[PDB]
Description:
The protein has two domains: 2-403, Alpha-Beta Barrel (TIM Barrel); 404-496, Immunoglobulin-like. A hairpin with a 2-residue loop joins strand 13 and strand 14 (366-367). The radius of gyration is 23 Å and the shape is globular. The strands form seven sheets. An eight-stranded parallel β-barrel has the order 1-2-3-6-7-8-9-10, surrounded by five helices. Strands 15-16-17-22 form a four-stranded antiparallel β-sheet, with helices on one face. It is of the alpha/beta class. 18% of the residues lie in helices and 19% in strands. The protein contains eight helices and 22 strands. Calcium ion (CA) binds at residues 100, 158, 167, 201-202. Chloride ion (CL) binds next to loops. Its cofactor is Ca(2+); chloride.
Amino acid sequence: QYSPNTQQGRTSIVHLFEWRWVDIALECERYLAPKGFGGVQVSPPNENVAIYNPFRPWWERYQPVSYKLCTRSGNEDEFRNMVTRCNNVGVRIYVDAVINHMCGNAVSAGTSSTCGSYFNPGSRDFPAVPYSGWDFNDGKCKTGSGDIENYNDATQVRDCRLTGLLDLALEKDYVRSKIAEYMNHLIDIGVAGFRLDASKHMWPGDIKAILDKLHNLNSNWFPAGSKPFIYQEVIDLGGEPIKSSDYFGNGRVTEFKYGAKLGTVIRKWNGEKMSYLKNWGEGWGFVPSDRALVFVDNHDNQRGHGAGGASILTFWDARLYKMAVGFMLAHPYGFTRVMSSYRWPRQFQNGNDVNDWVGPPNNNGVIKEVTINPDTTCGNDWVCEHRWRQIRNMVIFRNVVDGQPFTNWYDNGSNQVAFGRGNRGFIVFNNDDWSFSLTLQTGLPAGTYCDVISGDKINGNCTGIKIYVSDDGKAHFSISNSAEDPFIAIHAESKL
Length: 496
Ligand SMILES: OC[C@H]1N/C(=N\O)[C@H](O)[C@@H](O)[C@@H]1O[C@H]1O[C@H](CO)[C@@H](O[C@H]2O[C@H](CO)[C@@H](O)[C@H](O)[C@H]2O)[C@H](O)[C@H]1O
Ligand SMILES: *[C@@H]1O[C@H](CO)[C@@H](O)[C@H](O)[C@H]1NC(C)=O
Ligand SMILES: OC[C@H]1N/C(=N\O)[C@H](O)[C@@H](O)[C@@H]1O
Ligand SMILES: [Ca+2]
Ligand SMILES: [Cl-]
């Protein structure tokens, strides 16, 4: 559960949020594999509630009805087709496993689901699994509302309903087996791992009992004895009885303090500066590198639904976001996850977004296809951050510098920083309100290098800035605070 199971030399995964299976399959072949992306985190593939008030929100997918592979993203045949085509081209598939709960208790009984399966939240009947009232935590929860009321009581956070979501009794072997049957069906299809949703709301021992029932990965693509990659979503910002370290024996954990602090540093909040990033990682109270799944923003906090607050950098903050994603992809700490989103009509009323519910670009409920524009960007309101030159080239930078140590740090005591990754890469940042013009030590061999941020290396030449490294590793870098991208990155493969 700790090893990504990605192809050797591919170091990042991308969250293709709300994308259809046929579009991910095409993306695996046309972009992800040629550009060196390791994998894809997909939205929940299991049947969910079709919520019409409000109109088909993104969050309806976090309300399971059954374990049938039938969603707005596609059916079972389309899912298998995607997994097979992606694996054959070396791009892994990771499933967002929503296993803590079923739907909200206030949801109406009927067939208002993505595959037409009947369900009754009131009587706790989900015949398509099958689950009954005996499979839920209604008698185990000791709160007066039945929902989670206080986060200082570790027991209720696990045994009660997260905002009304019917809590599955995970101590029961029947419930563990039904979840394992679902996860094993997916492993055998070819998925490389899972995102365990709402892990904070499940007991570490209960998760371990479910993982013990899991198969090794499909031996047609993976070597014998390969265990599925497990990354648990535990939102731990400190100061709670539940720690993300309680989950280390099961797999990796999502490090939310990472995106929160990188956001405050780059926005320069509370006097924080980039020079403090010298000891970035464990020195800041984060989980150990080999247990961390890192990201700048996720599907939740990019629209204010998880934790991190107003500090979180998203595609809306384009210029600062590319620097954050650039820093993340260059720094050795943890396993990296790149976000790929869609544009929604943000509307701030009293400091908060009233349109945070808005689902994926659609036509009367049917999710729109990802159309490709002539400049490699996406149409139909898909932002496609993974396709932006600055982000795409930084994904390749991480691949080229894999295994190299953190060396040659420089800082001006403010926000102009720089570091190298052994003898394979170097990156410089300028987040100050003045220009940077200095000669720094790189650790890289002599030659002419293309800046992968301002341009590309197309047939023996650079389309952007050129950096000249001398015999002793020194190189002059000139970055203006007025530049579209106030950072320069050069690596072993961008060399002329
Ligand atoms: O997996 C359950 C949550 N835990 C998660 N990680 O721990 C997901 O990342 C997050 O997206 C999920 O909440 C999302 O999915 C929930 C179910 O759809 C939404 O709740 C919604 O449904 C509830 C029950 O019907 C309502 O009470 C609530 O007001 C309504 O917003 C919630 O706001 C939305 O952030
Ligand atoms: C690179 O481009 C420049 C013009 O920008 C040109 O002078 C030079 O010959 C090109 N190099 C090669 C190797 O073609
Ligand atoms: O306790 C942290 C945070 N963690 C959560 N789940 O793990 C909740 O969705 C959110 O409501 C809660 O505030
Ligand atoms: Ca629970
Ligand atoms: Cl996450």
